[PDB]
Structures are given as structure tokens and as C-alpha cells.
Design a protein around this nucleic acid. Structure first.
Lengths: 85, 199, 126, 149, 144, 112, 48, 73
RNA sequence: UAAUUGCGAUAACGAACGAGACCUUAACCUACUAAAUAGUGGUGCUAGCGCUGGUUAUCCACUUCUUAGAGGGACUAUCGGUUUCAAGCCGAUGGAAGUUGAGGCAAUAACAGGUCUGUAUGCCCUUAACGUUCUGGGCGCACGCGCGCUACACUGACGGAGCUUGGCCGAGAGGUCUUUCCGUCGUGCUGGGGAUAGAGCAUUGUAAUUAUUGCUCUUCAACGAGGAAUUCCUAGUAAGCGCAAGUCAUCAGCUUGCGUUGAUUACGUCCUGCCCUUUGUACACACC
């Protein structure tokens, strides 16, 4: 085969992607170009695993920096930010 | 005394998943626009056997209806409509989210670009087999457009670590912005290359 | 009481609706309508005509759906509520007419000639 | 099913006894523990003959298989109302000439000729190939209307 | 609104809500039967704890019961399960479900929830509806 | 269960009359007669109840051999006509049994 | 003279001599086609 | 390889000698793969058909021959 | 025009027969006449907190379910169009249009088709034998051909969740006192695929080894979507999920029907089968 990485959970546990680098670069940097982007498009462009992007979104959610909506196939949209309304 | 569905307490109520409007959508191409009906849909579905009738303007069509149906199908095998609607429901939302514009309008834009000017049927006559270039016939442009866009989305899903809805959005946006990365536009530009030349 | 049942149909599933006019709460299988039904965008289809009309509180729709494939159902349920009103207000005749409706297809499953693999589907060899 | 099963044995057994015999047609009607058995035969003499056994014997002959009950039976003699619509004599008369012979082509024409005089609207005779012991031509011939199908 | 809601919510949001209430019961003894492979081919128990094997099987069966009844060991088994004829290369699934059903049904008898007929099947009791309906009370408020 | 009506009080009534034929046209007619008799007699019984259908339709290659399409073709429908009386007198049993129009109609008086 | 057994199993007509057959009615599977025209049983007259 | 609450020791009176069951060896891995290698010779010293086929060398439990085995050899 | 189908001409005037009509029924409409299997209302037992709904109750009604009949059959009287003339073409309404849809009622005669072993009769073998009643064994296979069945994997794979029992009780298989959401997946020849192998357990049967089925358990086989190439199908049809009937002591699925899922293309004759006319013909069991 070809080979093979990003690769999770072991990378998720260790500092290298969880700490700052992945959440700030990947998830947070993308958002200024598009206000919302889907969780699955975001997986594919970043080259980040679906499971891997999912915990990171969840940490961010808690923070209140991002806001998800839903759909069953653990698809949905991911939005950062937003407003005065 | 109520309780009931939450929508707006009303107005004219836009349906189409309840999320988006159809009337705003423009088909730029004057020729194309005629065939593409969007004077009054939603997204529910329907069959109706309108019949093939030819030469003049043939039948009714919804662009969306055609798109869901191609997805279930192509391909190959063993796809159900509950999942097939679902993926589109999400796809429309991904597309809107990427563009910041009405998902139907992007769909239109994709289809109008991917639909070639001309095609290349294969005719045997005398001792040999020629291609002289052939009519597009306005529904067939549409059908081909959707099919091409639909194969591309499938091809990506299969190969790469992606759910369909995103592959379908990506392939559609990319066509909708005239980039050769999309399967659909690349084939359009090929088919029109071959047809112009083979004359 | 008030009970007008004129029974539509179009595709499989049988919706009998006996309608006693009050609050706009709706039942399906005698079970509340938004909550069961879930699995929706096509469910809200029904819901249009107990909103957009400007009559909300005029219909407690009691609908009992028994039997097939969740999708087929939706057309039948609607017809019965529309015909009933058309009797009483004949002036709200432009409520059946203008809100669309009708077909069905009606053509549910077709005949089995022998040797066809599923039915006419001949099979497969030179 | 099972009431039909009762039905399901009984006629074929009537058909097999009511075969070659010189007679004419057999309806059966079944009440509880009796079988009507109406024969339309001249040759009903052979089956009948009072007390003895004979009259009983073909009917009682029904009794054993599948049907029914400690009992006696009854039998009624009958006439014919035009032989064509059902019989056994209609079959047999051609069979009796097809034994020792006669002109085969004449027999085909003749048999059609009687019933067609008697109205019929249509009569069709078909006769096996091997005429004169040759090959098999097989032969038809029909007059009038006549429609099986 | 709540009682009627036992009957009339979409099953899952009902089962999810209900399973936390079930969690309180003392019972819930699996004794090592589950361990072989209860169902088709990848059925084991460690995801069972939150709303698993066992716990959804109870929670829901109770959701089912309210609306329906009467029931039995048999009725339950394939409600859930497959066991389709095979084009003879297959399985899709083997759902057993003869062991499974028995384990769920047994616990319920101890608490006093379910009752047993002579001809009829499984009936719900006064005890059985009470717990279901009372918990439903909490459910509807969360949802809206 | 027993639709009460003297005779030292009738404690008999439970009749089921099941009439099964090949031909619908012929069966109906016999059926009609049952209904009228109950009405004349003293007390009125219910009319014809015809429930559900018995099919064997069995699909068989003739056979050549080979017969590989185009099979030749064969249908059993039939029909069960279930007639109660509201009251089973003695007189009622006798008139119906004595005069019975069944030809192919197989009529079984059943059962206390 | 002694006795014997074994090769019990299903039933077939007399009218036709082959074992293989269909039980309900009680004749063999072509005998059944001959019989099917007849009608005898409630049902089959003919045709589909 | 072996856990606390579960366990399996071979029991039976003597003999049968070969092969035996050893009470369902788990024990899976090498001991299973290397077990069947013995079980085969044992099945031969048995005189089983299953053992004679092991000696004949052919598809064991009689596969169809209308088509098949073309990748295999 | 599917139709010497019907019309208009005509050295013809008829006339049969297939087609159609006819029947079947999947569609249907039912407002109804009929009756209740059943649907639905009124009790009574609660639960939310007769108000809102679940359950069963007594033959109390009417009805889409039921079914037997009726009637509604739907078609260019009926609103419509240029037009030898009868027409074709397309459209309203309706619930579908002039072939309303199936081909299931399919003409005669042929092809030495095919059947003597799915169903008798000539006639030879022959005749207390290719009678007889079995018992044991055979439907192995270096390769070809056929049909069929499962895969290659996300529209997926896993687990849980949306003659027949009641119920104590079972690894599966069984014996009886007894009447579509969400953990999981990481697009991996694997959590794919189940081939093959091997030991061992219950039942069908007297027996399961070449010739049962179900398998606990464990070997983990090829195959990365298939060449030269093929078959059908014109919307509930292709294609896909299953089930029951028959088969049947057992048995791969045969053959076969019911429902369920549900698509694409349908102009035309632009390799093959056919039709009528047309001419030529050296053929005539017929371009083999």
C-alpha cells in the first residue's frame, strides 16, 4: 500500500494535535473564509479524521467559540461565530 | 387551541425543505431556462407520466427531483430513497454554507455550465464509422449534466475518505465556479471539444 | 356531532378521518402528529392547510394511517379534510381548487407471467 | 380445501367407471349419505334390474372411497335431451364404427352431418393420422361455426 | 400531554429518556449468558452499559407494550430481529433471540411490571404503566 | 350464543349453515330461498354473509419437453356462503332439509 | 415368506404409475394436470 | 490465553487417546494452528475417510466439480 | 389500425375462423342493496395533570376494510381544429383515454421438432424373462458449457434498537409440566469475503461416510467490479429485500405465486425475427 497518517485516537490523546495546533489552525482558520462549513467537508479539506474532528469540535463547542447544529449520520454544520441580532 | 408546527407566524410560507426559496433562482441561459421549471416546487417528490412528446417543449421537470433520483441510482446498486433524500438535504445545506447563496441557484449554475453545446454520436455509413456532431436537445443537456455531476460525486466518495453529501457539494460548487477540478465541467469541455472538431 | 368522511386514497394506506372541529391538534394512529412523525420534511406537507388558509382553529384532524412503507400515505390524509369543508362552505370552494391535490398512480403491483424472473424479465441467454 | 377434497376425489372415479360402457353421461349430486347418480342411458338396463344387485351395484360402487356413511343409496333413470352437450354415446358410436371399420373419411363427414341437421351451430370432428395404416397426416374437418376458444 | 406522550413521542427520544430511569433498578443481572455471542456475528456487550443490549431491550419493550399488548416471549424476539432465508451463501443476520428475550422478561417479572397469561401473552400491570407514565412527565418539558 | 325463543323452552339454537359451490350463479339463487323461509316461519333470520376466498392457483410446465415459456394456464377461485338463522326451531330445521336445491351446492347442517 | 419393509413415503395415483407426485388430492404430478381440467375439486375450471 | 472466572481443563477417564477435545482449546493462536497439524496425522492413524482424504490430498468435504478450484492450484 | 380491424373503391356477392367484443382481474368509484368477519362510537380499569389518551367489555349502528350484486364502465353524442371522404393527430372534464393495461379466450397446417421414462395402442425382445421383492452402492471428475447463488465493500460491514404457541427453561440446533436511531468502522484484500480444512453436538431416518440439514469452534481461499463478449426491460415494468405455497422421511432451489422496495431510456425500424404487396427464380424434404 501507499501509507497512512492522521490516524487518531493515539494522536488525539498526545499533545501534538489536541493542545493548540489542530483546533486553532484547522477548524478556526478555515471559518473566516466560510461562515459555516459542514463537518464532513471540513474533514476532507483539512485531512483530519471524522472522529478526530468530532472531539475538537466538541471542546470548541464548550468554549462557545463554535456552534454546531445536527443531522443523524453525525453530519451537520459547524459555524464559528456570529452577530448582533 | 394551538400548539402545532413551528414555522413563521405566517406570510407566504417558503417550503423546499422549509429552508429555502425557489423563485429567486435565475437561469441565465435563455434557451435553458425554458426547460427548467421552477414555477412552484418544494422538495417532496412525485412521479407523473407526462409522456415523451417531442419537438416543442416536452414536459414538466424539477431540477431537484432529478438530482435526488440520479444519486440513489448512480452508482451502482442498492440505494434507497430515504437515505438518498437525506444526503441531498444535507448537501443543499453544505452548498449554501460554502457559497453564502441559495442552494437551488448553485445547482442551476452547476448544471448550466456542465451541459455541453454539442455532442458526438457514432454513425456507421458506407464503409466506415464517422462522428459528424449531433444535437444537444435541451432536456438531454440537463440529463447529461446531472449524470456527470452525479458520477463525479460517486467517484470521489468511493476513492477518498468522505461521505457523499460533501463529495456531491464539492463536485457541484466546483462546476458552479467553472473549475476543471470537477469531473462534470471537465467532461463538458471534452465533449464540446470533440464535437466542434469532428465536423 | 360533526363527522364528515369522504375518503380519498392514492397510493396504498387507508386514511379514515372523522373530524370534530375544535383546537388544531392532530393525531395519526391516534398518536400526536409532529412527535411521531419525526422523519420529516414531507410530513410538514400535511400541515400547510391547517395553517395557510387563515383557519387554524377549525380543524382537529383525527387521522389513522394503517399499513405500508412510511412515504405512500401523505396524499390520502389531505383529501378528506378538504372535501368536508367544501360541503359546508361552498365559497371555500377555492381552497380545494387552489391548493393543488390528486393523483395516486393506482397501479400497485403488476402481474406475474411465468418464466419472467421477477415477472416479464425473461432471463438471460442466447 | 377439505370440503373441496371430498369433491376432489369423487368425479374422476365417476369418470373412470363411466368410461367405455355403451351408455350416456353421468351427473352426480350428493346429499348426506346418498348419491343421486343420474344416467341418461338406454343401456341403463344393464346397470339396473331391480332388487338383485345390479342397480345398486354401480352406485354402491361410489360408496367406498372417500364418501360416506352407513346407508343405502338411490339411482334414478333418465331419458336424453339432445345427446351432443354431454354423453358417452356421442363418443362411443364413432368408436364402434372405428373398430371393424367403414370409410374413415365418410365417418368424419357423417357424424358432423347428424348433429348439424339437429342444429348444433357447429360440429368439429378430428380423426387420428394413420389412415390406411400409412403415416400420420392427422385430419380435421368442421362445418358451421363452432368455437372451443 | 405527558401520559399520552408515553404513547406519542418518537421512540428513541422516549427510550433515551427512559433508560436513565431504568438504571436505578437493582436487578439487571446478565449472568454470563450474553458472553458467547447473543445475536448475528458482532454482538457483544461492553457498549451495552449506557443503553445497550440488555437495557434498551427492556426500555423500549415497555414503550412498545403500552401501545400494543398482548405479547409473549415470541412476539418480542423478532420485533427487533431478522433471520431471513438465505440465498445460501449469506447470512445477513441470525438474530437468535430466544435467549435474549428470556433475560429481559425475567427481570421484569421480579420487579412486578409484567404479568403472564395462560393463552394471551405478556400483559402490562398497574405497576407497569405507573412508572412509564410518571417518567414521561419529565420527558415532554425537555423536548419543547 | 343461544338466541332464546316454548317446547319446554328451546335450548338448541346455534345453527351454522355453510354452502360451498363451484358456480356462483347457481349458489346465490339457493341462498336467497333460505333467507325468505326464516322470515315466513315466525321469526326472522339474517341474510347471506359471504366471507373470503380459497385459491389454489398452481403453475405447471405442460410438458414437452422443453417447455420453457408460455405455460398453459389454470385458476381455482372459490367461495363460502355462511347463512345463520336468528332462531333455530324444530319446524325451521325440517322445512330447510326436506326441500334443499343443492345440485353441486354442498350444504352441511352443523352443530349443536 | 418371512416379511419385509422400507421405502415408505408419499403417495401417487393408481391411474398413473410414478412415485413422484403431489399429495393434496392424491395423484402424481402430471396426473394432477389431467385432473386439473376436472373439477371434482371446488376450483380449477380453468384457465387463471 | 486463560482468564479468572472461565477455565477449561481436559477431563474424561482414560483413554480415548487421539484426538480428544482438551475441552475446546482457547488456547487459540499457535496452539490451535499447530494442534490441527497433529489432528490431521491423528485422523490418519484413525483410518478415517477424513484421514484417507488427508492422504489423497483432495478437497476434503467433497466440493462441486461443475466448475471450480481454478485459482486454488 | 397490434388487427382482410373498419371504411371507401372494385367482377363480385357472400360466408367461417383467429383478432376484437366475450371472461379474468390489478387498477377504480361508491355514493349504495346485502351481511358481518372488522373498522369506528358508548362503558369500565387507570395515567398525565371522562380534560387528554391506552386497554378489553356487551351482536347497539352505519362504512372506506369484507365480499356478492348493482349501477358508475370513460367515450371525440359531449365543448373543439384544416379537412376527396370514414379517419388520423393533439386537448377539456374526470379517476384512466379511442391500441384504457396484462396477454392469460390465440386460426388452420406444418417441423419425421420433442415425449414410448411427465400418457395409453401397434409390433419384436419375449413369456412361472429387459418378472419379482429388495439390500447395500452410485447423480467421482486433469477440462468445456449452461442456468443460478454470494462477493469485491459506505447507496457498506457489526451489534442493538424502530401446523403453530402460551411459559418454566437453552451455546446454536432445542426439550416440555402444559393449551429506521446510535456504540462500532477508517475505504482496510480488512471489523471485507466466506471458500476450504478439522475435531465435536442434536434432530429427520434403520442408516448422514462417496450422498441430510442446522453448527459450537476454529482454519481464514480465490476474487480490487470482471475479456473476446450477452440477455431483457418501454414506469410499479427493468433491478433489488423477503415470504409462503408446492417439492419434501431429508435436501442446496427448483419450479412457483403473494407483498414489500423502486429507477432509467422509450424517437423509430436508422444486426435479428415477421407481415403483406412487388419482380425474378435454374430452388421445391426447399440457400444447411
Amino acid at each position: 500500500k501507499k501509507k497512512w497518517s492522521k490516524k487518531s485516537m493515539k494522536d488525539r490523546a498526545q499533545h501534538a494535535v489536541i493542545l493548540d495546533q489542530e483546533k486553532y489552525d484547522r477548524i478556526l482558520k478555515e471559518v473566516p473564509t466560510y461562515r459555516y462549513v459542514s463537518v464532513s467537508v471540513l474533514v476532507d479539506r483539512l485531512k483530519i479524521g471524522g472522529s478526530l474532528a468530532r472531539i475538537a469540535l466538541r471542546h470548541l463547542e464548550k468554549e462557545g467559540i463554535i456552534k454546531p447544529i445536527s443531522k443523524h449520520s453525525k453530519q451537520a454544520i459547524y459555524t464559528r461565530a456570529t452577530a448582533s441580532e | 387551541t394551538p400548539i402545532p408546527e413551528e414555522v413563521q407566524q405566517a406570510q407566504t410560507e417558503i417550503k423546499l425543505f422549509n429552508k429555502w426559496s425557489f423563485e429567486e433562482v435565475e437561469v441565465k441561459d435563455a434557451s435553458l431556462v425554458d426547460y427548467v421549471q421552477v414555477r412552484q416546487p418544494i422538495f417532496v417528490a412525485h412521479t407523473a407520466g407526462r409522456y415523451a412528446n417531442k419537438r416543442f417543449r416536452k414536459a414538466q421537470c424539477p431540477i431537484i427531483e432529478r438530482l435526488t433520483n440520479s444519486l440513489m441510482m448512480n452508482g451502482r446498486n442498492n440505494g434507497k430513497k430515504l437515505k438518498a433524500v437525506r444526503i441531498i438535504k444535507h448537501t443543499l445545506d453544505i452548498i449554501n454554507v460554502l457559497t453564502d447563496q441559495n442552494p437551488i441557484q448553485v445547482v442551476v449554475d452547476a448544471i448550466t455550465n456542465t451541459g455541453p453545446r454539442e455532442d458526438t454520436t457514432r454513425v456507421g455509413g458506407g464503409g466506415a464509422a464517422r462522428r459528424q456532431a449531433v444535437d444537444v436537445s435541451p432536456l438531454r443537456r440537463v440529463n447529461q449534466a446531472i449524470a456527470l455531476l452525479t458520477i463525479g460525486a460517486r467517484e470521489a466518495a468511493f476513492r477518498n475518505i468522505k461521505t457523499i453529501a460533501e463529495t456531491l457539494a464539492e463536485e457541484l460548487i466546483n462546476a458552479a465556479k467553472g473549475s476543471s477540478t470537477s469531473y462534470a465541467i471537465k467532461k463538458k469541455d471534452e465533449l464540446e471539444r470533440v464535437a466542434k472538431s469532428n465536423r | 356531532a360533526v363527522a364528515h368522511v369522504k375518503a380519498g386514497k392514492g397510493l396504498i394506506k387507508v386514511n379514515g378521518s372523522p373530524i370534530t372541529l375544535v383546537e388544531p391538534e392532530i393525531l395519526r394512529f391516534k398518536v400526536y402528529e409532529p412527535l411521531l412523525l419525526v422523519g420529516l420534511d414531507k410530513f410538514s406537507n400535511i400541515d400547510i392547510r391547517v395553517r395557510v388558509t387563515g383557519g387554524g382553529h377549525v380543524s382537529q384532524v383525527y387521522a389513522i394511517r394503517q399499513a405500508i412503507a412510511k412515504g405512500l400515505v401523505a396524499y390520502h390524509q389531505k383529501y378528506v379534510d378538504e372535501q368536508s369543508k367544501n360541503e359546508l362552505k361552498k365559497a371555500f370552494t377555492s381552497y380545494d381548487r387552489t391548493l393543488l391535490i390528486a393523483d395516486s398512480r393506482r397501479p400497485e403491483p403488476k402481474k406475474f407471467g411465468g418464466k419472467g424472473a421477477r415477472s416479464r424479465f425473461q432471463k438471460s441467454y442466447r | 380445501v377439505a370440503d373441496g377434497v371430498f369433491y376432489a376425489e369423487l368425479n374422476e372415479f365417476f369418470t373412470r367407471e363411466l368410461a367405455e360402457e355403451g351408455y350416456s353421461g353421468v351427473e352426480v349430486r350428493v346429499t348426506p349419505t346418498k348419491t343421486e347418480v343420474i344416467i341418461r342411458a338406454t343401456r341403463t338396463q344393464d346397470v339396473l334390474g331391480e332388487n338383485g344387485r345390479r342397480i345398486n351395484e354401480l352406485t354402491l360402487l361410489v360408496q367406498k372411497r372417500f364418501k360416506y356413511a352407513p346407508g343405502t343409496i338411490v339411482l334414478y333413470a333418465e331419458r336424453v335431451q339432445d345427446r351432443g352437450l354431454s354423453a358417452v354415446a356421442q363418443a362411443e358410436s364413432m368408436k364402434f364404427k372405428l373398430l371393424n371399420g367403414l370409410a374413415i373419411r365418410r365417418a368424419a363427414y357423417g357424424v358432423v352431418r347428424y348433429v348439424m341437421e339437429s342444429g348444433a351451430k357447429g360440429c368439429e370432428v378430428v380423426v387420428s393420422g394413420k389412415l390406411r395404416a400409412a403415416r400420420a397426416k392427422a385430419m380435421k374437418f368442421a362445418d358451421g361455426f363452432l368455437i372451443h376458444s | 400531554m405527558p401520559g399520552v406522550s408515553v404513547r406519542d413521542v418518537a421512540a428513541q427520544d422516549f427510550i433515551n429518556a427512559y433508560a436513565s430511569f431504568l438504571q436505578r433498578q437493582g436487578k439487571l443481572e446478565v449472568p454470563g449468558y450474553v458472553d458467547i455471542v447473543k445475536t448475528s456475528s458482532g454482538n457483544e456487550m461492553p457498549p451495552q452499559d449506557a443503553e445497550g443490549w440488555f437495557y434498551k431491550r427492556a426500555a423500549s419493550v415497555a414503550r412498545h407494550i403500552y401501545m400494543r399488548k398482548q405479547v409473549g416471549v415470541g412476539k418480542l424476539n423478532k420485533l427487533y430481529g431478522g433471520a431471513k432465508s438465505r440465498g445460501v451463501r449469506p447470512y445477513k443476520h441470525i438474530d437468535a433471540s430466544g435467549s435474549i428475550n428470556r433475560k429481559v422478561l425475567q427481570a421484569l417479572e421480579k420487579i412486578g411490571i409484567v404479568e403472564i397469561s395462560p393463552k394471551g401473552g405478556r400483559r402490562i400491570s398497574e405497576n407497569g404503566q405507573r412508572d412509564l407514565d410518571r417518567i414521561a412527565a419529565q420527558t415532554l418539558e425537555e423536548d419543547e | 350464543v343461544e338466541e332464546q325463543e316454548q317446547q319446554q323452552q328451546i335450548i338448541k339454537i346455534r345453527i351454522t349453515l355453510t354452502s360451498t359451490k363451484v358456480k356462483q350463479l347457481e349458489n346465490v339463487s339457493s341462498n336467497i330461498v333460505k333467507n325468505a323461509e326464516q322470515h315466513n316461519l315466525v321469526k326472522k333470520g339474517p341474510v347471506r354473509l359471504p366471507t373470503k376466498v380459497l385459491k389454489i392457483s398452481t403453475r405447471k410446465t405442460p410438458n414437452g419437453e422443453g417447455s420453457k415459456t408460455w405455460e398453459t394456464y389454470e385458476m381455482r377461485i372459490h367461495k363460502r356462503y355462511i347463512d345463520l338463522e336468528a332462531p333455530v326451531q324444530i319446524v325451521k330445521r325440517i322445512t330447510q332439509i326436506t326441500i334443499e336445491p343443492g345440485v353441486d351446492v354442498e350444504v352441511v347442517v352443523a352443530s349443536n | 415368506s418371512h416379511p419385509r419393509r422400507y421405502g415408505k413415503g408419499s403417495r401417487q395415483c393408481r391411474v398413473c404409475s410414478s412415485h413422484t407426485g403431489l399429495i393434496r388430492k392424491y395423484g402424481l404430478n402430471i396426473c394432477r394436470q389431467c385432473f386439473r381440467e376436472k373439477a371434482n375439486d371446488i376450483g380449477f375450471n380453468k384457465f387463471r | 490465553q486463560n482468564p479468572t472466572h472461565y477455565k477449561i481443563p481436559a477431563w474424561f477417564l482414560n483413554r480415548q487417546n487421539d484426538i480428544t477435545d482438551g475441552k475446546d482449546y482457547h488456547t487459540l493462536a499457535n496452539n490451535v494452528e499447530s494442534k490441527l497439524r497433529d489432528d490431521l496425522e491423528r485422523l490418519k492413524k484413525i483410518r478415517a475417510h477424513r484421514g484417507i482424504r488427508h492422504f489423497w490430498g483432495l478437497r476434503v468435504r467433497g466440493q462441486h466439480t461443475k466448475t471450480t478450484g481454478r485459482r486454488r492450484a
